[PDB]
Design a protein around this ligand. Structure first.
Ligand SMILES: Cc1cc2nc3c(=O)[nH]c(=O)nc-3n(C[C@H](O)[C@H](O)[C@H](O)COP(=O)(O)OP(=O)(O)OC[C@H]3O[C@@H](n4cnc5c(N)ncnc54)[C@H](O)[C@@H]3O)c2cc1C=O
Ligand SMILES: Cc1cc2nc3c(=O)[nH]c(=O)nc-3n(C[C@H](O)[C@H](O)[C@H](O)COP(=O)(O)OP(=O)(O)OC[C@H]3O[C@@H](n4cnc5c(N)ncnc54)[C@H](O)[C@@H]3O)c2cc1C=O
Lengths: 577, 577
């Protein structure tokens, strides 16, 4: 693209919501759309991106921002980690994520009303939760009712394409789950999600479905990859966003201008950073780094909320995990790799997560004197999920997963199960994203503030206990477990579990909130139309907009945000739509 | 003590060097000495303090500052830890340390000349390295020449009082060491230290020898424990230190004044902090926290240097470690505990470290292409120890040691060996101590900057390899090893070892340098008489003074610093001494 070029719409950050907004705005072939993006422009050409079983290997790769971030910062404990993985590539984090497609609980989205008014509640959002996807059920295994989860969008989704060898595993896990007295559930798309379900995925015919699928073969979209944002171009007199400044690989600064609107989609971490570098954020924090304040927006970078996860690995009987096929070199791996290469069939095309659980654990919580007291102190309402929401998402990954074992080596032998214990309704206060300096090439500082509240530790402990009961005592599955890796979970000691949770937890990869939808600038950074409070012609569409984190893996809500954003922009520009 | 009281000398921080200086100045019964100290005043009354086998249990106890500190801060990796243990109690860190008494290499102390001139070199310092100690050899096991290591001081020291059951262990380790072609050595007190030695300790008749032994039964010493320093009292016009302000348990601020001199002994972390709070430090760093600059002293808090350590545990054959006697509850433990209680005999009185190795590893280093290139680039001189110094201190702790395994649980069964691989001559740049704020009750911020230079990683890797060779291949000992805890050291992969070293390393507990001796304020913070550049009547005596870290565990050099400081103060006040 030529320096100083004008486009109707500029999307800053070709990520998950970014491409969604861009592709929708481009549906009028006459509307000019520019996308600027730090990463490569041709993800579909990269096997590790398109191949679902390679996902975890994308951590630390060239497609990963690989941020340092503080996971917990309590007086008794603090840990900082790297990499806190985020996608750096067209498609953003939808190009390196773990595929699960799940919206969340109706009661939770209904509470968005406090921030976004009625249009940001469950029912009105349902269509936006479905618009991006085209649902498939080729093997005809699931209720035809479930076809309503795809509205016709360019992101192919399907229930996991089941691995044949894992059928015995699925059957035992199912038996175990029911033996605990917990429900099976298939429809988790209408606001209810209690039980063990067969998850859907952004995978189809063993290929990844990334947001880059929104923006190809559209000649009205100009895609400029490999450029790093320096600053939003803001006219102070007009209080207007004019466009964006970027730096090329050769180190040249380029300005691009939007004739209608700029949409900021740089994700939960970089969106608030670029706002601040552009003069929009907490005034004391700007001054501290030599940045003028154009709009004193206190909430920018604040309210960072994520799900803490404590994963744990069990060694399981031979043939009940995929380690020997996918993880280790050999003829077995060679075979499935050769099949995948010829027609994309086989387990190489698998995302390795097929059964997912959304339980409550009231009866475990009730056994803890402290939880009992906190609940009473809250007038008898459950602190975590007072509206019937799950307490956990339990992901049963059917092999050792490096992405969920940041400090333990990969075992050399044996098949494994990796259970991701994801606290989906935490009550710890949010963390924050702050500036390290005014340098656009430095990562912002990131504190997730996991487990600031002790109750969260107690719940996480109890969700590990629930998972252990299920797997060590559950019908069928109890016979599959061989050992705990890399040592025993100290479930016998509240004291030890306290240390175990803090020291072993990680991000579940769902950060949100840093430029949240709101009714005014004293509550959040963007209004219900996702316009930046205080600025004209500037909107944010990405996970930073999310005012209350969904009860599950969040990519579905992020696409929803992009779909709604595009709709709201179209409604505004009558002459174009 | 009464508010506003005057004393000839005020020691701020009743720690290792602190008490040394105080006790020596008090040798003229007419000189009044005050000691202020944050911790308790009666350590000799605390079993866990006086009992050498309890040392490791003092981590996280009430006697531990338990600082958060950043261990490594590289672009590819960063870890922050808690607790970074320091003594909070009369005697300071000499009240919770692991006893080893070893001075270091002559060539290294000779290089102090660049900072302190001739009087801070090996020969002149020898007497100061010996003054604090009274050497014992009751069982008459060692050369009578070695009695020269005790000059008659109030700190009883002895070669480790050997545990009988560990004799077979010592004998096998010795055989293994010699089988590798490395020397045995007993005299490591005259500047030479190449080999495996029987270490001496600040233990005698199974009681800890702490610096509090310097300051009891001296009625001219006023001891005020349980008070937290707020600030040094500095007269700007006179450029003079007048005394110190402290806060009591009840929250009252008290001023105490020195008629001759104030000696700051708050240790490597708190000494630079209090200087800064008092207006002495880097001016930009003071202003940033609202503190006036009285003296722009750039080096304050800078030059923090410590030894990185990568410990590792081996499970060893039954009866070749002390786990079953000291670590686990039972009749065995009951028996030795009952003996200790009646007459202080038995392994309960042991510091658990009896053999210590000081090897070079030139031939391991030479195998690494990068080391070879770096050495050539340094004109053919070894980067680490170009003057013949050791590369490592290898501590062979004869049981599982929690103090050296910060992220692994304590094994439930088996006897263990804990090998502390201490890189004693690192070449990474120093870290820093900075202010978090002007609040005297907040810990300063601490970055140790371990492994900033890749060569250090290569050496640490190779010192682990040397240790593994010794123990897995060495004569006698090879037959004792049962397994690696908690998994295998990835010695087969330079790549994995790189991650292993960074992720498993810790402080070896020897921080230094943050107010270093120097010839002028452009080089350091105190002059050769340990006077603070720019200020009269103010000296620093503690580990922050140390300009080049010794080649080993450092408590001996710290007492040396205190002994010299006291001598230099006495020489100045003729009318009193
Ligand atoms: C491991 C991983 C695994 C998970 N797994 C599951 C999953 O299983 N399913 C689930 O639903 N969610 C999961 N998630 C969340 C899910 O993947 C969602 O994608 C996120 O929750 C929300 O997607 P945004 O639209 O809010 O943010 P985005 O980062 O996508 O797009 C931002 C774009 O901007 C560019 N960009 C940024 N800065 C600059 C700059 N300075 N100059 C120029 N360009 C810049 C940057 O390169 C990128 O292209 C997962 C995420 C991670 C990993 O991040
Ligand atoms: C685990 C541990 C184990 C090791 N093991 C071996 C060992 O085996 N042998 C060895 O030679 N060295 C080892 N070392 C180092 C060795 O122990 C040495 O002691 C150190 O290397 C050097 O000793 P300072 O004189 O330089 O510093 P100090 O902290 O002693 O005294 C400071 C005093 O000031 C007080 N004080 C501080 N702040 C305030 C305040 N605000 N307001 C009021 N008071 C305040 C504070 O409470 C304390 O009393 C080891 C240390 C640690 C642990 O710290």
């Amino acid at each position: 693209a030529t320096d100083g070029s004008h486009f109707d719409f500029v999307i800053v950050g070709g990520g998950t919501a970014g491409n969604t907004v861009a592709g929708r705005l481009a549906e009028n072939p006459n509307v000019t759309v520019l996308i600027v993006e730090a990463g490569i422009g041709n993800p579909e050409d990269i096997p590790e991106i398109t191949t679902p079983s390679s996902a975890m290997d994308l951590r630390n790769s060239k497609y990963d921002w690989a941020y340092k971030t503080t996971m917990v910062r309590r007086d008794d404990y603090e840990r900082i980690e790297k990499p806190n993985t985020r996608g750096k590539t067209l498609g953003g984090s939808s190009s390196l994520n773990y595929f699960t497609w799940v919206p969340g609980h109706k009661a939770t989205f209904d509470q968005w009303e406090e921030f976004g008014g009625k249009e940001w509640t469950w029912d009105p959002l349902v269509p936006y939760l479905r618009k991006s996807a085209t649902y498939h059920d080729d093997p005809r295994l699931y209720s035809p009712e479930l076809e309503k989860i795809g509205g016709g969008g360019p992101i192919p989704i399907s229930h996991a394409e089941l691995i044949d060898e894992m059928a015995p595993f699925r059957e035992n896990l199912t038996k175990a789950w029911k033996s605990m007295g917990q429900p099976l559930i298939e429809n988790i798309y209408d606001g209810e999600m209690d039980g063990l379900t067969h998850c859907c995925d952004t995978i189809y015919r063993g290929q990844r479905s990334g947001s880059f699928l929104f923006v190809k073969n559209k000649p009205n979209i100009t895609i400029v990859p490999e450029v790093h944002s320096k600053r939003l171009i803001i006219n102070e007199a007009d209080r207007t966003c004019k466009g964006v400044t970027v730096v090329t690989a050769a180190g040249n600064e380029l300005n691009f201008f939007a004739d209608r609107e700029v949409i900021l989609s740089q994700g939960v971490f970089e969106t608030p950073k670029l706002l601040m570098l552009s003069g929009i954020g907490p005034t004391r924090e700007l001054s501290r780094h030599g940045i003028n304040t154009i709009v004193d927006s206190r909430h920018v970078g604040q309210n960072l909320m994520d799900h803490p996860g404590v994963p744990f690995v069990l060694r399981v009987k031979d043939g009940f995990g995929m380690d020997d096929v996918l993880l280790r070199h050999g003829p077995k791996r060679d075979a499935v790799v050769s099949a995948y290469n010829k027609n994309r069939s086989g387990p190489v095309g698998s995302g390795l997560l097929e059964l997912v659980g959304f339980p409550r654990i009231d009866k475990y919580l009730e056994k803890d004197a402290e939880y009992r007291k906190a609940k009473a102190a809250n007038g008898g309402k459950d602190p975590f999920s007072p509206l019937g929401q799950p307490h956990f998402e339990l992901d049963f990954v059917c092999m050792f997963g490096t992405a969920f074992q940041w400090h333990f080596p990969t075992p050399k032998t044996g098949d494994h199960l990796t259970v991701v214990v994801d606290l989906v309704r935490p009550i710890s206060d949010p963390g924050e994203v702050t500036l390290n300096s005014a340098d656009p090439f430095q990562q912002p500082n990131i504190n997730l503030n996991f487990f600031a509240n002790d109750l969260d530790i107690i719940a996480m402990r109890e969700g590990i206990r629930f998972s252990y009961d299920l797997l060590f005592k559950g019908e069928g599955f109890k016979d599959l477990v061989e050992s705990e890796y890399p040592w025993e979970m100290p479930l016998d000691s509240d004291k030890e579990m306290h240390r175990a949770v803090l020291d072993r937890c990680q991000t579940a990869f769902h950060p949100t909130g840093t430029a949240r939808l709101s009714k005014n600038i004293d509550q959040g950074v963007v209004d219900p139309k996702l316009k930046v409070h205080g600025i004209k012609k500037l909107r944010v569409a990405d996970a930073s907009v999310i005012p209350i984190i969904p009860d599950c893996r969040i990519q579905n809500s992020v696409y929803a945000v992009g779909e709604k954003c595009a709709d709201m922009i179209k409604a505004e520009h009558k002459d174009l739509y």
